[PDB]
Design a protein around this nucleic acid. Structure first.
Ligand SMILES: [Zn+2]
Ligand SMILES: [Zn+2]
Lengths: 286, 278, 162, 287
RNA sequence: GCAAACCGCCUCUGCCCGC
RNA sequence: GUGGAAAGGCGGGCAGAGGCGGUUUGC
C-alpha cells in the first residue's frame, strides 16, 4: 500500500531502536502534554478503530530497512535450488541469521524469490563508561552504560497507515514534542532526541490470506510462524508486567491484534500497544 | 503540566587542552565517536560537572537559603561519609557505590531543593525527573573541515614524575584535545511550572559561570580544562508551537555575550517577551 | 645491477640501503634518475608513488655524498614556517620563497670544500621546483612540494646520513 | 567531610624568561626536519607555551623540599607533620612510614599524604592536593597553561625569532674531543601570560595557603624553571598584573563585585613582604 | 698565499594507585 | 500515557639529571 514513513534523524546516541510498544507510550505521553487526557482516550479509540503505527527500523541514506519475514526459513532450500551445494550451504546460513532487509529485497522475500542480505548494519552497540564522583573527595565508582550510535547519514524510522486527519491531529504534533524530549533511555544526557521528517513509502506486497507483522503482535489467536518477544516497560515509575509479544516479521493469519489496558495503581488507565501492522505474505505448506 | 521548552544553543571553546578519558595508539585516550573517530564532550560529563559545582555552591549556602528553597532545612553542611548511614542529617546524603551525592529522597522534597528540581532525583517511591537535557557537544563544522584538511585534532602530551631527591624521571602520556577547538552545545530546559523557572535558569547560568573558572574533566589542576561558553541564541518554543506547528517561537538574540553579560547584564532585557507570555 | 635495483616505484628500499653502506654503480644509475628528476620540471608531475620514487633516488644519490642536515636546517625550518602560514595565516609565500631561494643560494655560496657536490646536487633538484612555485598557488602545488621535500630528508636518515 | 565554597582567589600576570627557557617535548609527530630537543608547542597556533603541569609540579617540588628542611618548626603550627621525619623511603622500599617522601610514583618518591584528614592538616597537600585509597583529597589550586602574551603573538607575525638554537658542546677532559648537540630554546626576554586560581574552601586557613603559594613563587625566582637550569636555562621572573577575589555573590549575580587587589608594580617578594595585610584587607572585609 | 680536517648526539626513566 | 528515574572516567604526578662549539696539524 502507501504508508507515511516518519523518519527520526538522530542528534546523539539512543538507548535502543524503539519498538511499537515504546513508541505508542511515548506518543501517548506527548499528546497528554500538549492536548490532555481527553485526547489520549481519543487517540486510543483511533488506533482500535482505524490504522496503527509500526515498530522503528534503521535506514542508511535512502536505504529504508525492513525486517526479514519468518516466511523464508521453511522455504529457504527451495529459494536456493539453482545454486551449487558447497556455496549454497553457507549462503543459506547467513540468510537465516540476517535480521533486516532492504526496501527492495523485502518485496522479494514476500514472494519467495531469491534475495540478498545487506552488508552493513547502520549502527553500533558501544559501551561508554560513566563514573560517579564523590562530592568531597572526588572518589570514582565506574559503572558501564550501553548505547546505539548511528552513522553519518543513518537514522531510524517507523511507518503509519491510517486516516490523515488522525495523523496531522495526533501523530504529527506528538512527534515534534518528542524531538525535544526522548524516546526512552537517559533523555537528560541527550539520548532520545532527533529531528523529524515526513516522506512517503510504497511497498509492493502480494494479496494473500496470511500477513507479516511489522510491529509487536500480542495476538488473539495462535499465529502461524512466530518469534517470541518478552518485555514490559515502565510507566510513571510503575513497573509494567512482562507480556509475551511477538517480534516483527512474524506471520499471522487474519489477526487484528489488540491493546491490553493495565491498572498499575495510577490515576489513569495504561494501554499497552499490541496492534499488528499487516503486510501480505506468501507461505509454503506450513 | 507542559508549557514550553526554553532552548539554549551556543558553543564550547576549549581554550586549553580538554581531556575526557575512556581508559581502553595513545596510552590515555580521550573518548571518540566510533564512526568518525572525532572526539566529543558528552552530555553526561557536562551535566555532572554543572551539578558538582552547583552542589558545593548550595552546600555553602544552606543556612542563607532556608526560606527561598525549603527542604534545605533538613540538611547540615557536610558529608555522610564517616557514619555510613544514608539520608542522614548531612547534605551529601546518598551513597551510590563509594561516592556521596546530594539526591533528595522524595518527590515532595525535590520540588523544593534547588539542585534536584533542576537536575533530578531518584528516591524510593519518588522518581523526580530532571528539567534539563544536556546534549553531547560535537566539533563545529569549521573544525570537522580541519579534520578533512589533514590536521591533527587531538595532540598527545607527555608529563613526567620526578623524585624530590635524586631526580629520577618517570614519564607517561595523556592524549588531549588540541587547544582552541569549538564545540556545539545544547541545553533544553523543560518548563513544567510557570512560577519557578527564572530561579532554574539563573541557577543553570551560575553553574556555567563556575565552570568558566573551574575546569571540564581531565587533569584540570595541571591546566587541562579552561572552557568558555559562547552563547548564540535562546529560544522559547511555546505550547502553541507544538499543537499547530506554525513558527512563532520567541528568540533571544545574543551573538557575542558572555556567561556574565547574560546572567544580569541583559536578564531583565533578553527574557522580556518570555516573562510576558509566561 | 644498480639500475635494475633502482626500479620504477619502490625498487629496493631494503636493497639500496645495503649497497649505499657503491661508488661506480651509483655514480651513473642515480645520475640518470637525478636527470629524470630535473627533466620532471613541473612539481605536479607525480600524483602517484613517483614523488616517493624520485625522493628515494634523490636521497640515495645524496647519501653517497655527505649532505649534513645541519647545513640545510635554515632551509628546512623555513619550509616548516611557510607551511604553518598556509593554515589560514597567509597565502602568499612569494615574498618569502625568494628568501628561501636566497637561503638555498647562500648555503651553496658557503658550502666549500669536499662538501661541494653534496650541495651541488641538492642545488640541482629543488630549484626547478622553486621555479614552478614562484607562479603557483600555495595551498595546492605547494602541498606536493613540501611532501616531496620531507621524503628526501626522511629517507636520508634511513640510508644513514645526517 | 564538609567541603564548602566561598570564592576563587585568582592570580594573573606574566612570566618573564630573563634567561632563555626550554620546556622540552618529544618529536616524531609527523615532523621531519627540525632542531633536536624541541620546545613544546601549541599545535594549533604553532607557538611555544608553558604547561600548567610543568609549573604546578615545579612549585610543588620546591615547596616540599622547603618543608623537609623544617619538620620541627612547622609542626607547632600544622598538625600531622609529626607523623613524618626528614628523609626518603629510598633506603627502605616501603610506601607509608615515617619518611617525608612517601609515594613511589613509578620510581620517584614524592610527598603525598595518604588520607583526607592527614592531608587536611598538611601545608603541602592542602595547597597542591593528594591521592589516596578511600580519601583522595583534591587540590585547591589550578594552574593553567601559559601561552605567549598578545604582544609576542605580534612579534611572531613581524618575523622576529620567538625561538633560537643554542649549541652546547661536551668535551672529554683527557682527549679534548667535542660531542656537539643543538638545543632549541625560547628567546630570552619572552613573556608568557599565566593563571593560578586558588579555591577558597576554609576561611580559617586561607592566609597560609596564599603565604605558602607566594613562598614557592619566591623560591622559583631563586631557582630555575624547566630546562637545564644549572647551565643557565632557567631564571623565571613573575610579573603580577592583579590579584582578584571573585566572591560567591559574583557567580550568582554577574555584577563586578570582585575585590581587586593591585600589585601592578610590585614583586613576588614584595607581596609576601610587609603589605600582605595592607593588600588583602578588603578580602577580610568580605570573607 | 689561507685554512682543511672530525664531532654532530651520548646514557639512564616511561602509568601508577583507587571503585 | 516511554526497560524507566538519579549518576563528571578522575584524584595525585617538573620531560627531567650530566655536558666550555671545541681541539689538532698542515697544503
Ligand atoms: Zn535536592
Ligand atoms: Zn602532605
Amino acid at each position: 500500500p502507501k504508508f507515511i514513513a516518519v523518519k527520526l534523524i538522530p542528534k546523539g546516541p539512543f538507548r535502543d531502536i524503539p519498538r511499537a510498544d515504546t513508541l505508542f507510550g511515548a506518543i501517548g505521553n506527548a499528546i497528554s502534554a500538549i492536548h490532555g487526557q481527553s485526547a489520549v482516550e481519543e487517540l486510543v479509540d483511533a488506533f482500535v478503530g482505524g490504522a496503527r503505527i509500526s515498530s522503528a527500523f534503521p535506514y542508511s541514506g535512502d536505504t529504508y530497512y525492513l525486517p526479514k519475514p519468518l516466511s523464508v526459513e521453511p522455504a529457504l532450500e527451495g529459494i536456493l535450488t539453482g545454486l551449487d551445494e558447497e556455496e549454497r550451504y553457507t549462503t543459506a546460513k547467513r540468510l537465516r541469521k540476517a535480521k533486516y532487509l532492504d526496501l527492495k529485497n523485502f518485496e522479494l522475500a514476500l514472494r519467495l524469490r531469491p534475495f540478498t542480505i545487506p552488508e552493513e548494519i547502520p549502527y553500533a552497540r558501544v559501551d561508554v563508561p560513566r563514573v560517579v564522583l564523590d562530592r568531597v573527595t572526588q572518589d570514582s565508582s565506574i559503572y558501564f552504560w550501553e548505547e546505539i550510535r548511528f552513522r553519518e547519514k543513518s537514522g531510524v524510522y517507523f511507518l503509519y497507515s491510517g486516516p490523515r486527519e488522525v495523523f496531522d491531529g495526533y501523530i504529527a504534533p506528538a512527534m515534534r514534542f518528542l524531538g525535544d524530549t526522548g524516546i526512552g533511555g537517559k533523555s537528560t544526557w541527550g539520548a532520545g532526541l532527533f529531528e523529524v521528517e515526513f516522506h512517503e513509502m510504497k511497498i509492493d506486497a502480494p494479496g494473500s490470506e496470511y500477513s507479516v507483522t511489522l510491529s509487536n503482535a500480542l495476538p488473539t489467536k495462535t499465529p502461524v510462524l512466530w518469534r517470541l518477544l518478552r518485555k514490559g516497560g515502565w510507566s510513571f515509575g510503575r513497573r509494567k508486567p512482562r507480556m509475551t509479544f511477538i517480534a516483527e516479521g512474524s506471520i499471522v493469519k487474519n489477526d487484528p491484534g489488540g491493546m491490553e489496558r493495565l491498572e498499575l495503581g495510577l490515576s489513569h488507565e495504561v494501554y499497552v500497544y499490541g496492534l499488528t501492522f499487516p503486510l501480505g505474505v506468501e507461505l509454503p505448506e506450513g | 503540566r507542559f508549557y514550553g521548552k526554553i532552548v539554549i544553543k551556543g558553543k564550547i571553546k576549549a581554550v586549553t587542552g580538554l581531556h575526557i578519558g575512556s581508559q581502553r595508539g595513545i596510552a590515555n585516550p580521550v573518548i571518540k565517536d566510533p564512526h568518525t573517530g572525532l572526539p566529543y564532550i558528552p552530555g553526561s560529563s557536562l551535566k555532572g560537572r554543572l551539578r558538582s559545582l552547583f552542589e558545593i555552591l548550595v552546600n555553602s549556602r544552606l543556612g542563607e537559603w532556608r526560606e527561598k528553597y525549603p527542604s534545605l532545612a533538613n540538611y547540615s553542611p557536610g558529608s555522610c561519609r564517616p557514619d555510613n548511614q544514608e539520608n542522614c542529617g548531612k547534605f551529601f546524603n546518598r551513597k551510590i557505590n563509594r561516592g556521596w551525592i546530594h539526591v533528595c529522597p522524595d518527590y515532595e522534597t525535590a520540588l523544593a531543593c534547588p539542585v534536584c528540581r533542576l537536575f533530578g532525583a531518584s528516591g524510593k517511591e519518588s522518581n523526580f525527573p530532571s528539567r534539563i537535557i544536556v546534549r553531547d557537544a560535537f566539533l563545529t563544522k569549521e573544525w570537522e573541515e580541519k579534520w578533512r584538511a589533514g590536521e591533527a585534532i587531538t595532540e598527545a602530551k607527555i608529563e613526567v614524575g620526578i623524585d624530590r631527591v635524586t631526580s629520577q624521571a618517570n614519564p607517561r602520556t595523556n592524549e588531549r584535545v588540541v587547544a582552541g577547538a569549538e564545540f556545539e552545545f545544547e541545553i533544553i530546559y523543560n518548563v513544567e511550572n510557570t512560577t519557578h523557572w527564572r530561579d532554574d535558569i539563573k541557577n543553570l547560568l551560575t553553574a556555567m559561570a563556575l565552570l568558566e573558572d573551574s575546569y571540564l574533566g581531565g587533569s584540570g589542576s595541571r591546566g587541562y580544562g579552561k572552557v568558555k561558553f559562547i552563547f548564540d541564541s535562546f529560544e522559547f518554543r511555546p505550547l502553541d508551537y507544538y499543537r499547530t506547528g506554525k513558527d512563532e517561537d520567541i528568540v533571544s538574540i545574543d551573538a557575542r555575550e558572555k556567561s556574565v553579560s547574560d546572567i544580569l547584564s541583559g536578564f531583565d532585557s533578553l527574557f522580556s517577551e518570555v516573562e510576558g507570555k509566561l | 645491477v644498480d639500475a635494475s635495483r633502482l626500479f620504477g616505484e619502490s625498487p629496493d628500499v631494503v636493497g639500496i640501503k645495503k649497497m649505499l653502506e657503491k661508488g661506480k654503480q651509483w655514480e651513473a644509475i642515480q645520475p640518470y634518475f637525478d636527470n629524470v628528476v630535473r627533466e620532471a620540471k613541473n612539481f605536479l608531475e607525480w600524483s602517484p608513488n613517483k614523488r616517493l620514487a624520485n625522493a628515494v633516488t634523490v636521497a640515495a644519490y645524496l647519501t653517497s655524498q655527505g649532505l649534513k642536515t645541519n647545513q640545510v636546517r635554515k632551509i628546512l625550518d623555513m619550509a616548516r614556517t611557510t607551511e604553518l602560514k598556509v593554515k589560514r595565516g597567509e597565502g602568499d609565500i612569494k615574498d618569502d620563497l625568494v628568501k628561501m631561494r636566497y637561503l638555498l643560494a647562500y648555503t651553496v655560496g658557503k658550502a666549500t670544500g669536499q662538501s661541494k657536490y653534496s650541495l651541488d646536487a641538492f642545488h640541482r633538484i629543488l630549484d626547478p621546483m622553486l621555479e614552478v612555485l614562484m607562479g603557483s598557488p600555495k595551498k595546492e602545488n605547494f602541498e606536493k612540494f613540501y611532501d616531496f621535500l620531507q621524503a628526501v630528508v626522511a629517507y636520508h636518515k634511513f640510508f644513514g646520513g645526517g
